[PDB]
Amino acid sequence: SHMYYSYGNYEAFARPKKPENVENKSAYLIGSGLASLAAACFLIRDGQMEGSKIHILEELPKYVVRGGREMENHFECLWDLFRSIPSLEIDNASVLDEFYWLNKEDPNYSRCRVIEKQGQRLVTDGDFTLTKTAIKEILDLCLTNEEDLDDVKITDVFSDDFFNSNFWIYWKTMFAFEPWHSAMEMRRYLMRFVHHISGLADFSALKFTKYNQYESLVLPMVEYLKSHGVQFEYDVKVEDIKIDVTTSQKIAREILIDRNGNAESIKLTINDLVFVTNGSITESSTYGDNDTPAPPTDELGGSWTLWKNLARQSPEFGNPDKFCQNIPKKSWFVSATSTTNNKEIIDTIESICKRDPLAGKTVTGGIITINDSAWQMSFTINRQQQFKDQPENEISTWIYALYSDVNGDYIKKPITECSGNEICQEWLYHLGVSTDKIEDLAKHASNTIPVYMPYITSYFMTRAIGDRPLVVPHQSQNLAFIGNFAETERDTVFTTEYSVRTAMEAVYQLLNIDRGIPEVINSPFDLRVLMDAIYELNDHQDLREITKDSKMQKLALAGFLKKIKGTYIESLLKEHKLL
Amino acid sequence: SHMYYSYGNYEAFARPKKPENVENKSAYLIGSGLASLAAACFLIRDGQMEGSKIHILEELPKYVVRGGREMENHFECLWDLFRSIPSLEIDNASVLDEFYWLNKEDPNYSRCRVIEKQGQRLVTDGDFTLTKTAIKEILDLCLTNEEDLDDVKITDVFSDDFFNSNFWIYWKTMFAFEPWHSAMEMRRYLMRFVHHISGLADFSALKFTKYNQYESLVLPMVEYLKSHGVQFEYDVKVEDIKIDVTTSQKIAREILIDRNGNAESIKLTINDLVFVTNGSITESSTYGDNDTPAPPTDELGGSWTLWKNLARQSPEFGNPDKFCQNIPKKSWFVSATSTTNNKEIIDTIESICKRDPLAGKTVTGGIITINDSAWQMSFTINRQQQFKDQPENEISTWIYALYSDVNGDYIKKPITECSGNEICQEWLYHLGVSTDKIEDLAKHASNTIPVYMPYITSYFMTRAIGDRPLVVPHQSQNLAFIGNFAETERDTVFTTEYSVRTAMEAVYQLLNIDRGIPEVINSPFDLRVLMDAIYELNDHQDLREITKDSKMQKLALAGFLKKIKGTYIESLLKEHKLL
């Protein structure tokens, strides 16, 4: 046991000893992603490794919004990391200090969630409209083991009652889930955010940064790492890492890189740690403009080629083909972001979200789902402005579509064939804007940049156990896997927390840092949390109202209330407004 | 709602804003106890109050062991406080840093717990020997509401099966419980440490400081407070505080003090906060020596007189007479500490606890209970030495007796009438030392100092709701109550955490500090914790073994396993070794 999980304030504020033999250890980190930079920060702080021994290998040499970066308070590893990171906006404060102070003065909540029939709000908005069978299937999915859910789709565990409910409309749009996605990952998502079911439709439990994650999270970490002398090597293309797999131990021996076009090799010892971010969801992302579509592609990038080369060496390094291959053509591929300063587009937006987009505060509270759209278009507007040099009179909205190969409503073309204005054409169509001024507002009054990510749905692909390698593989001495494609316990991918948690576990295991890693929050194992979930799932109903029709549950409930009458259980039932 | 509870790493590392109008606010703190000094530290750190505006009023002008200061990892408020406090032993570290590092290199566990028949270990040691009815009564106490347990004794909720079990032997000695004590406080104790039931007999869950709490906790806080310029006024005897109770608000207007023998008054405004530690368990503590007993007394001290004077002003300031009056004469009154360097006394101690007392590490793992002693004597030896100038060849043991008016085994006198050597006489009697060298080893080879605390059992006295005032009373502007006699939610008195938690809540409510106060740990509301408790309570038995005799439970269990077969519940049952 090279690590142990923990919770509470004891292991939270505790600093570990400097681990043994660190001063003769180095670290090479492939990529400059969020998980890679988090691992370097943990090596500096918790591992007490000097910055000159840490190398960041970056492929690239020395307005687009990557939306969907929702955050919540129980990102235990993220706030453990973003504590010693000083901020760049205000002095004598951390990244968490600004995030705490900004989310307490302007709480995030959505006054409108789903609209349909070109602008009109959904009549059953706020309610989940989950039937008894839909709630049963939700419980059945959570009560099934993770081992029994290997290569199981969402449609294999849910019926047509679940998909017709408003709960699925919120769930499929908040997390960009698809019906052909992993049931293991969805089951992890239901258990992780079971305490946010009350704040699910109105987004009251969601927390947002002042800007995008690049300048709110990545840039503060870059400034922190550069202050400690962390070496950043650029123009480095990592082909493959030579691993010798013996029956007793596995050591990274050598890395083949392409340093500024010249292929050369770095030698490795047992002390020289290697951190690999296998796979990438932003790789091979073609871009478009307001007049031409983003060209579709399926070219495997550097991150996917490295994982394929590593997987051939050992079977327990994971299967990269289960994520980067055979992605359905109906999956989410194209996302667009539109920037405008035109008044009547903003006025239409204000008429739907009931808040001023130029006020500088929470605008939409999150995303807005177009239920009638054939593309399953969903758009969001964050606290404008999300950028530094962006003018104060301009707003930036982010648009993504779930289905890809279906013709749109106003434009009879798929999202893959529509240019930047044409995506903005149908977006204005569903906002209630008339079909006469719709054309010139997109082509001239707004600038929309499409982007085609062919791997933006890879983390939710159906997988088995062992398809994702362990964060530190078994019997591994200096090789670690970080990012959203590394296997850990009970955590949800496509979150900033998952990348940070994998970074923390990799550093703590390889360096044998004897400090408790903060476990995933115990909401699914909490009596109070599970009771609040039952109340919220069936549209704010007491136990008498939930079982008012079924006789088998009514008899069982009557015996239950008889045995708990005048007890602390009944007090728990009443204070959670279930009785 | 002037405060809110929270948990997790978000509110743990978050620093609050400087609260409004603080720079015109002052603070007067009565007493220099653990709770009082904790409140001053919170005012400096979280309240950002300058030290010159904080006053500590101390009655006193400018080897004894106060044993029983067990600590555990989930003292959430204590580690929140002892984080910014720098240590005095090692540099560039906090009090928590040393505590974390010392308790990970030398884990605390007891190789012997209960001895009887003059030295021999209990045959059923480690086991709880709780019957089915005893486990039923334990569950019934935890499942009853706190409101229904007003003025309820321990004997009123438990039967003779519970008191004959080894669980009660450990419980009545770890926490110095008595059969005539508050069932509310015991129910809080069972729910608080329900996750430590596995580590209850062997003390594997207990954590200890390097020295006594005065030098490990109080002195680091004193040095921290003096570095910030906190004013310490000495020779100040607080008689009463003038409170005007209107229908809308209550304000501390004036405090009557006796400054160095001269009675004078300090005026108060709404901004001038007042923190009162009502009651004291160490007050009116008479001392003895190796030849004379500690003289018994019942004189109300300054802390009890202040609470009585405050209680007359308003009914919701609590009832001090329910704790300081009518304490039974069989209750714990006399404690002794014995210091020796004689070899054969140490050798006898090593022969029982199986560890060297002079090694500098964990010696007894906690306390040792004498089951055959009429006094219910229990003695402990911590990591020697517990003091600074104490020689390396000397050990210091702490002896307390639960029953007080009963004659001892070797000495036919009560503990109240026995001198320092005579307490050491019967202690050596139960260690297996022969009845020939027993006398001169206590009178000449050891020095034992008795102490008579008449209020060392007041916090466990039977109480109703409102007997203890709220930490901040309702409609109170500048008056707060801190310490073990203030009422808070779900926390256990006679712990360092309770004094710190009351200090944190008082500072956060009076100053309107908008940061989450860490709640009491959610062990009673955790599915995993409750399942481990069931396994440990019935002496490591599976559900088939627990219900192997009762037919009503056997039928219900068979239906339960049928409904959970091949589910995540069954996985939870197996991984908690309950199935």
Author numbering:
A (entry chain A), B (entry chain B): -1 to 60, 75 to 591
Excerpt from the publication:
pmcOleate hydratase (OhyA) is a bacterial flavoenzyme that catalyzes water addition to C-C double bonds of unsaturated fatty acids to produce hydroxylated fatty acids (hFA). OhyA purifies as a soluble homodimer where each bilobed protomer contains three functional domains: a fatty acid lobe for binding substrate unsaturated fatty acid, a flavin adenine dinucleotide (FAD) lobe for binding cofactor FAD, and a carboxy terminus of unknown function. Each OhyA carboxy terminus is a helical region containing two amphipathic helices (helices α19 and α20) that arrange in a helix-turn-helix (HTH) motif that sits above a hydrophobic cavity from which a tunnel leads to the active site. In this study, we found the carboxy terminus is a membrane anchor that enables OhyA to solve the topological problem of accessing its insoluble substrate in the membrane bilayer.
OhyA was spotted on a grid for cryo-EM analysis to study the dynamics of the solution structure. The addition of 50 μM lauryl maltose neopentyl glycol (LMNG) detergent dispersed the particles, cured the orientation bias, and enabled structure determination of dimeric OhyA to 2.61 Å. We observed multiple states of the OhyA carboxy-terminus in the 2D classes from the dimer dataset. 3D variability analyses can be used to detect conformational variability in single particle micrographs so we performed 3D variability analysis to measure the dynamic behavior of the carboxy terminus in solution. 278,661 particles clustered within a cluster with the best density for the carboxy terminus, consistent with the crystallographic conformation. The reconstruction from the variability analysis of this state yielded a 2.79 Å map. The states primarily differed by the overall density of the carboxy terminus, but no discrete sub-class of molecular structure was observed. This analysis confirms the carboxy terminus is a flexible domain that can adopt multiple conformations, but there is no preferred conformation in the trajectory of the carboxy terminus in motion under these conditions.
